[PDB]
Amino acid sequence: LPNSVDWREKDVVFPIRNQGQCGSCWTFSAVASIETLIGIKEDRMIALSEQELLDCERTSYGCKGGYYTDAFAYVAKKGLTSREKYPYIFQQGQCYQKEKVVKISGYRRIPKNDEKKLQSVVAQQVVSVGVKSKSRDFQHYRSGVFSGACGPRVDHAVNIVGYGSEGGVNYWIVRNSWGTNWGENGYMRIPRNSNQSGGYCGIAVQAAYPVY
């Protein structure tokens, strides 16, 4: 495996987005993983609709949380339209089935706590993960390899877009949907192979990724 991976430098990751208040992080995480997968497999960068998932994915809770795994299943069964055709309106609305621009074939779930298998997959694509976000340290993070306190429970869907090392401290590169004023232009470097079981802030507890 490569010592370092950063899909942002590979022309397959769109700019950081902002979910606002709506608990639609799961739609952002699912969309981010699919967008990059389509970029890797087809060399096509097409911005996809979080709003369709929020409005139309029936296992989730709209602005009160949801499942990127089931979002993958939805895209595999029904396809997904573009962000231009169906933009994000910061709240759940009427479910529209517009012209779809992409499918996937399925998804896979990574075993709990297996950062080694996680690294294997991150070296090939972007992965959807959940983190324990509900803490002052996590919300107020600005720069560096995060060393602060996590929330009590996994409650926030994000993505891993790469991995690397600074001063011999291994980290994952985490894409969030809180806009660019959070962290390092919207991203966080979180310890990799850390001493927290489930990964730092639970990042390895429930990882999943789309299959083209």
Short mmCIF file of C-alpha atoms in Angstrom, two decimals:
data_model
loop_
_atom_site.label_atom_id
_atom_site.label_comp_id
_atom_site.label_asym_id
_atom_site.label_seq_id
_atom_site.Cartn_x
_atom_site.Cartn_y
_atom_site.Cartn_z
CA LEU A 1 0.00 0.00 0.00
CA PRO A 2 1.16 3.58 -0.63
CA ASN A 3 2.71 5.42 2.28
CA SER A 4 0.36 8.30 1.48
CA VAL A 5 -2.96 8.73 -0.32
CA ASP A 6 -4.80 12.00 -0.99
CA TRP A 7 -7.68 11.71 -3.44
CA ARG A 8 -8.15 15.49 -3.28
CA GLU A 9 -4.95 15.75 -5.37
CA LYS A 10 -6.28 13.22 -7.91
CA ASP A 11 -9.04 15.34 -9.47
CA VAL A 12 -11.88 13.22 -8.06
CA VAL A 13 -13.08 15.16 -4.98
CA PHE A 14 -15.45 18.13 -5.19
CA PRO A 15 -15.13 21.18 -2.90
CA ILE A 16 -16.25 20.96 0.73
CA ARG A 17 -20.00 21.47 1.19
CA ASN A 18 -22.12 22.65 4.13
CA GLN A 19 -25.11 20.72 5.48
CA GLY A 20 -26.26 23.61 7.65
CA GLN A 21 -28.41 22.54 10.60
CA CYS A 22 -30.24 19.67 8.91
CA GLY A 23 -28.93 16.28 10.02
CA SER A 24 -28.27 15.28 6.42
CA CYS A 25 -24.58 14.40 6.94
CA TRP A 26 -25.43 10.83 5.85
CA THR A 27 -26.52 12.10 2.42
CA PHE A 28 -23.34 14.17 2.13
CA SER A 29 -21.20 11.18 3.08
CA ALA A 30 -22.94 8.84 0.63
CA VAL A 31 -22.77 11.42 -2.18
CA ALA A 32 -19.08 12.13 -1.54
CA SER A 33 -18.17 8.44 -1.74
CA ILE A 34 -20.13 7.94 -4.97
CA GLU A 35 -18.82 11.09 -6.68
CA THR A 36 -15.23 9.99 -6.16
CA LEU A 37 -15.98 6.40 -7.17
CA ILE A 38 -17.42 7.65 -10.47
CA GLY A 39 -14.36 9.87 -10.88
CA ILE A 40 -11.98 6.96 -10.30
CA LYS A 41 -13.80 4.49 -12.54
CA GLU A 42 -14.95 6.72 -15.42
CA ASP A 43 -12.68 9.77 -15.16
CA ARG A 44 -15.93 11.75 -14.98
CA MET A 45 -16.55 14.32 -12.24
CA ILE A 46 -20.29 14.85 -11.78
CA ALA A 47 -21.78 16.54 -8.69
CA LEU A 48 -24.61 14.44 -7.24
CA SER A 49 -27.74 15.31 -5.29
CA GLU A 50 -27.75 15.10 -1.50
CA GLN A 51 -31.32 16.41 -1.65
CA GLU A 52 -32.66 13.36 -3.48
CA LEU A 53 -31.33 11.07 -0.75
CA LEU A 54 -32.67 13.33 2.00
CA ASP A 55 -36.15 13.44 0.46
CA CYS A 56 -36.40 9.94 -1.06
CA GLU A 57 -34.32 7.45 0.94
CA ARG A 58 -36.97 5.70 3.04
CA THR A 59 -34.96 4.06 5.86
CA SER A 60 -33.53 7.35 7.15
CA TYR A 61 -34.92 10.18 9.29
CA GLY A 62 -34.52 13.14 6.96
CA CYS A 63 -32.97 16.03 8.86
CA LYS A 64 -32.77 13.89 12.01
CA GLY A 65 -30.14 11.45 10.76
CA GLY A 66 -29.86 8.47 8.49
CA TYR A 67 -27.84 5.71 6.89
CA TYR A 68 -25.23 6.09 4.17
CA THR A 69 -25.28 2.30 3.78
CA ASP A 70 -28.97 2.35 2.90
CA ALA A 71 -28.30 5.39 0.71
CA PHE A 72 -25.89 3.22 -1.30
CA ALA A 73 -28.60 0.56 -1.60
CA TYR A 74 -31.01 3.25 -2.81
CA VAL A 75 -28.59 4.46 -5.52
CA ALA A 76 -27.95 0.86 -6.61
CA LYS A 77 -31.70 0.25 -7.00
CA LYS A 78 -32.94 3.65 -8.22
CA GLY A 79 -30.01 5.73 -9.47
CA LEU A 80 -29.23 9.29 -8.39
CA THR A 81 -29.69 12.66 -10.09
CA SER A 82 -27.27 15.59 -10.31
CA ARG A 83 -26.83 18.40 -7.82
CA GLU A 84 -27.67 20.86 -10.62
CA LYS A 85 -31.00 19.12 -11.28
CA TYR A 86 -31.89 18.74 -7.58
CA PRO A 87 -30.01 21.21 -5.36
CA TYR A 88 -29.70 21.10 -1.58
CA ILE A 89 -32.32 23.28 0.15
CA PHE A 90 -31.13 22.71 3.76
CA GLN A 91 -34.30 20.85 4.78
CA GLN A 92 -36.31 17.82 3.73
CA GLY A 93 -38.82 18.42 0.97
CA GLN A 94 -41.08 16.62 -1.48
CA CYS A 95 -39.35 13.56 -2.94
CA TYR A 96 -38.72 14.08 -6.65
CA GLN A 97 -37.57 11.36 -9.03
CA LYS A 98 -35.81 13.33 -11.75
CA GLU A 99 -33.59 12.12 -14.57
CA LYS A 100 -30.86 10.01 -12.98
CA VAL A 101 -27.23 10.57 -13.92
CA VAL A 102 -25.45 7.68 -12.12
CA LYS A 103 -25.96 4.26 -10.56
CA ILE A 104 -23.74 2.01 -8.51
CA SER A 105 -23.95 -1.77 -8.21
CA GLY A 106 -23.83 -2.15 -4.43
CA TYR A 107 -21.85 -1.50 -1.28
CA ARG A 108 -19.66 -3.17 1.31
CA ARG A 109 -19.32 -2.76 5.08
CA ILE A 110 -15.87 -2.87 6.70
CA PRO A 111 -15.54 -5.03 9.86
CA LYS A 112 -15.75 -3.08 13.11
CA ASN A 113 -12.43 -1.70 14.40
CA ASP A 114 -10.33 -2.90 11.42
CA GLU A 115 -8.21 0.14 10.49
CA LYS A 116 -5.94 -2.10 8.41
CA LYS A 117 -8.75 -3.19 6.10
CA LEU A 118 -9.91 0.44 6.15
CA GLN A 119 -6.50 1.57 4.87
CA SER A 120 -6.60 -0.99 2.07
CA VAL A 121 -9.92 0.40 0.86
CA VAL A 122 -8.95 4.07 1.27
CA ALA A 123 -5.96 3.45 -1.00
CA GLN A 124 -8.49 2.61 -3.73
CA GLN A 125 -11.40 5.03 -3.13
CA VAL A 126 -13.23 7.32 -0.70
CA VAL A 127 -14.94 5.66 2.28
CA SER A 128 -17.99 6.69 4.31
CA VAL A 129 -17.50 6.61 8.10
CA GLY A 130 -19.17 7.73 11.31
CA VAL A 131 -17.47 9.70 14.07
CA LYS A 132 -18.21 10.82 17.63
CA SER A 133 -18.68 14.51 16.86
CA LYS A 134 -20.53 15.92 19.88
CA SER A 135 -17.72 17.61 21.79
CA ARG A 136 -16.35 21.14 22.05
CA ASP A 137 -12.92 19.89 20.93
CA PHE A 138 -14.27 18.34 17.73
CA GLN A 139 -16.52 21.27 16.78
CA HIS A 140 -13.79 23.85 17.49
CA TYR A 141 -10.97 21.98 15.70
CA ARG A 142 -8.92 24.18 13.35
CA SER A 143 -5.57 22.61 12.46
CA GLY A 144 -3.13 19.80 13.15
CA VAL A 145 -3.54 16.11 13.82
CA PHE A 146 -6.54 16.07 16.14
CA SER A 147 -5.65 15.21 19.73
CA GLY A 148 -8.80 16.40 21.52
CA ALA A 149 -11.81 14.73 23.06
CA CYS A 150 -14.50 13.03 20.99
CA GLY A 151 -18.23 12.87 21.51
CA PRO A 152 -19.78 10.09 23.58
CA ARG A 153 -21.24 8.13 20.66
CA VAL A 154 -20.88 7.78 16.91
CA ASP A 155 -23.35 10.36 15.62
CA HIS A 156 -21.96 12.11 12.53
CA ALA A 157 -21.40 10.76 9.01
CA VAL A 158 -18.25 11.92 7.22
CA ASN A 159 -15.72 10.53 4.71
CA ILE A 160 -12.09 9.44 4.61
CA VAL A 161 -10.38 10.80 1.47
CA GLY A 162 -6.82 9.70 2.20
CA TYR A 163 -4.12 9.09 4.76
CA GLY A 164 -0.65 10.29 5.58
CA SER A 165 1.86 11.08 8.28
CA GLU A 166 3.29 14.22 9.87
CA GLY A 167 6.26 13.93 12.19
CA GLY A 168 5.66 10.19 12.29
CA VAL A 169 2.04 10.56 13.44
CA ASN A 170 -0.24 8.65 11.12
CA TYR A 171 -3.57 10.21 10.29
CA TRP A 172 -6.66 9.81 8.17
CA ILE A 173 -7.86 12.74 6.06
CA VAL A 174 -11.52 13.28 6.96
CA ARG A 175 -13.99 15.22 4.81
CA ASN A 176 -16.78 16.92 6.77
CA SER A 177 -19.87 18.82 5.62
CA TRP A 178 -19.62 21.84 7.96
CA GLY A 179 -18.21 24.22 5.34
CA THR A 180 -14.66 25.44 4.93
CA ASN A 181 -14.46 27.46 8.17
CA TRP A 182 -14.22 24.23 10.18
CA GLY A 183 -10.88 22.53 10.54
CA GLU A 184 -8.37 22.60 7.70
CA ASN A 185 -10.54 24.17 5.00
CA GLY A 186 -13.36 21.81 5.97
CA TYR A 187 -11.23 18.70 6.60
CA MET A 188 -9.70 17.10 9.70
CA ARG A 189 -6.55 15.06 10.15
CA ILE A 190 -7.51 12.42 12.73
CA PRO A 191 -5.06 9.87 14.22
CA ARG A 192 -4.66 6.60 12.32
CA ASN A 193 -3.91 3.27 14.02
CA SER A 194 -4.60 5.16 17.23
CA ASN A 195 -5.03 3.91 20.79
CA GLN A 196 -8.81 4.38 20.70
CA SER A 197 -10.72 1.17 20.04
CA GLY A 198 -12.93 1.64 17.01
CA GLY A 199 -10.42 4.18 15.75
CA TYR A 200 -10.04 7.75 16.93
CA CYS A 201 -13.53 9.17 17.55
CA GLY A 202 -14.92 5.79 16.45
CA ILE A 203 -13.87 6.31 12.84
CA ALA A 204 -13.41 2.56 12.18
CA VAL A 205 -16.65 1.43 13.87
CA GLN A 206 -19.01 1.43 10.88
CA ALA A 207 -17.11 2.16 7.66
CA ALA A 208 -18.79 1.44 4.32
CA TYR A 209 -18.09 2.16 0.68
CA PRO A 210 -19.90 1.91 -2.67
CA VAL A 211 -19.17 -0.77 -5.27
CA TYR A 212 -19.18 0.48 -8.85
#
